[PDB]
Amino acid sequence: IVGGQECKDGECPWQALLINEENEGFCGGTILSEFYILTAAHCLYQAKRFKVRVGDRNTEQEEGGEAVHEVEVVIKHNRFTKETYDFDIAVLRLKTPITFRMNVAPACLPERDWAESTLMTQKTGIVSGFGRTHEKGEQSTRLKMLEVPYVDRNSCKLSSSFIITQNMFCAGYDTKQEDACQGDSGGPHVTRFKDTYFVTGIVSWGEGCARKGKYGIYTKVTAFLKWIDRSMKT
């Protein structure tokens, strides 16, 4: 996360962290339930073997609440391809159930039609992760969050070197130096409605981080609510 600030205790409880066999984070995820993590399909291409850490807020200190989970099944969208980054979604079933606690709790899945009309029309959403704090720099040892405005699809298309599909939406800032960055992908984009946070996106890609005239691109979760449903039930 470039800009923004550190998540306070309990503030970003749906954050998950995919960790490689070096025990280093390389992607985020969203807790959907005691057994399921939502992440980006492109994240599955990095570590051949990875685990999931929940409850972590500082990767340099072991603090109460941290737990590690092995992944039992990876459900990657059949249509994802790096040619387009379209359908950049996967679900992970964990071998053992997450115990919800301080800093560990799922984000709500909205109902599709209501999400489209009510959440996707909100001014902002919140993105979080442990990724780089500057485009060329180091990953953050602390969990960060960032409020990101929804960006008009056409303004986004005009700004983008690549095709923005119906399974994507754009969020962030034209020139202000705040955005998600390398290491944050796979992680949550959630939208608060009244008193509840609903998962609306998956951090997916960007041309750099926080570049002038470029936005953050997210998988549009509303497009995949039935898919997520089926994936969690199989």
Added chain:
Amino acid sequence: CSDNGDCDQFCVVCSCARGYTLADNGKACIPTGPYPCGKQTLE
């Protein structure tokens, strides 16, 4: 549904995500456990 039908969550007929029940009033949503989805956690 265009003040959200006065609903706390989904929308006139209100409803709520998994781990919640619609309150008697029929607009608010009540968590059934200590860690309902989409709520920041309290110590």
